[PDB]
Amino acid sequence: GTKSVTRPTRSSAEITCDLTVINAFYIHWYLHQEGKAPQRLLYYDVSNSKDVLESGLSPGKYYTHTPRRWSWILILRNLIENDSGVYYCATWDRGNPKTHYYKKLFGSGTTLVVTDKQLDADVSPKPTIFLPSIAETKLQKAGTYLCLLEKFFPDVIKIHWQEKKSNTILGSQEGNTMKTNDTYMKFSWLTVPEKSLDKEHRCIVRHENNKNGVDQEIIFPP
């Protein structure tokens, strides 16, 4: 359920709470920047429907929308560069057969990026796939596909290979994101045995700024 949200300066941002808990009483929100410890920003009381901010924060900046029953959304105003990070929706758990109070259930986390977002062009990932080398299958008796993606601004990208149908999840090693100018680039590969080249493989890449608002799908030759 991971996701990213990119917004310009002075705009407003929405961050969804992935918790499906029921009859909760408080909903805490945590910010995790880069290189810094996670820290709580606020906590929303649903018994009285009021959000309490940690000391040192300017009122009128956050909000905990509750569009439905047991569904929460954090709303940020006056976005500036510092607002970027990861946002977690968390809550304690009440009761147990053995009263441990063991954990604090944490959400899936949503990345937020704040940019200028006025000179930004279309930054959807553009795939430039690779074909297996015949010399490689000549002796090693295997094929190594390579799904290359380039020129995407939000680095939060999920690439996984599903062969032809979703039930066939194949382990695929993947390199780290590489920064090219203002955008980012990535590449993944998959090694398949002799009894795999008879099918078609897809590197189903999920990205926020992807075209059509849905995850892409790149068919490979057999």
Binding site: F25, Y88, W92, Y101, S108, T144, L148, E174, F187, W189
Partner: protein, 202 residues
């Protein structure tokens, strides 16, 4: 309260054990200490909670070495897998009787699991190309020390090689470059004092 984690990056072989420190200063009488794991997909997963008034609790492969007067708790992970490469956060928690109580986390350490100490293996080198882009693939070499060199004449842009662990237990490397003469490139691997060329297998 203030929690600091000394380590910034830890690397351990598979099936070994690792220990991550957590120093902290508090003021309350009774408190709690939790350990959380953040995957590369940004998912905070609960690991263990140690009762301050209780003994050294053990949960699965995770153990905590806690002493009441120590003011420092360390997490010991035994029989490391390959999916344990993550970011470990140490959190101090106020008495959980109330619901407003928050967890104060540290900067968090990072854990990486390299393949076990292995005999050397000669890697296999191949070249892929679609357009001006060129990919050099190196397979199944245990010693991380490697230097992939792409020999050509019109290198426009170059990318640092990506070296990853394989399901077989060894290393796979891939290097990507931009070349006008796509078919005129060659690959050289200076691994373990030995030289491997891409054409040695054709």
């Amino acid at each position: 309260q203030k929690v600091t984690q000394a380590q910034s990056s830890v690397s351990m072989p598979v099936r070994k054990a690792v220990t991550l420190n957590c120093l902290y200063e508090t003021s309350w009488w009774s408190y709690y200490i939790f350990w959380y794991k953040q995957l590369p997909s940004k998912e905070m997963i609960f690991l263990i909670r140690q009762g301050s008034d209780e003994q050294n609790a053990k949960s699965g492969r995770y153990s905590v070495n806690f002493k009441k007067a120590a003011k420092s708790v360390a997490l010991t992970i035994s029989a490391l897998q390959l999916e344990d490469s993550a970011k470990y956060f140490c959190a101090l928690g106020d008495p959980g009787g109330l619901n407003t109580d928050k967890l104060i986390f540290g900067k968090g350490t990072r854990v990486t699991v390299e393949p076990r100490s292995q005999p050397h293996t000669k890697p296999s080198v191949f070249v892929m190309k679609n357009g001006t882009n060129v990919a050099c693939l190196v397979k199944e070499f245990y010693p991380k020390d490697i230097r992939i060199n792409l020999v050509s004449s019109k290198k426009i842009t170059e990318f640092d090689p990506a070296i990853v662990i394989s399901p077989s237990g060894k290393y796979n490397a891939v290097k990507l470059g931009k070349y006008e003469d796509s078919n005129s490139v060659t690959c050289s691997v200076q691994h373990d004092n030995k030289t491997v060329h891409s054409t040695d297998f054709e």
